[PDB]
């Protein structure tokens, strides 16, 4: 929900632990596009 | 790979990447009714989730 990104030839990279990752709040919303992986699957993400 | 590959590419050979429940062993499942992913229901051969 930021304002700004960085450009594709200098890509943001953020850290991410020490957190709980809810993806219900994410996933479960039409606002996205696009939503496809490559080791993993969006029915499963919360059990990881 | 030389005999059952394409140089464009092969794309006969489907997977199923959902399913409600694990099946039994030496199920067979040929539905390709589409999965509900979502809390929506989906009639229609696609939605979001
Ligand atoms: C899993 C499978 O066999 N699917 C086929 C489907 O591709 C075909 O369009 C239809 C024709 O009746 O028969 C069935
Ligand atoms: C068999 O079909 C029923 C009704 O759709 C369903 O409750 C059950 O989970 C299915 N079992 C398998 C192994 O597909």
Redesign the interface.
Known sequence: NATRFASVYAWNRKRISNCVADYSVL??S?S?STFKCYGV???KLNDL | NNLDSKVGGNYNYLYRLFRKSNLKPFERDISTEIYQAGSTPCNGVKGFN
């Open positions: 996933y479960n039409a996205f699957s969006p029915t």
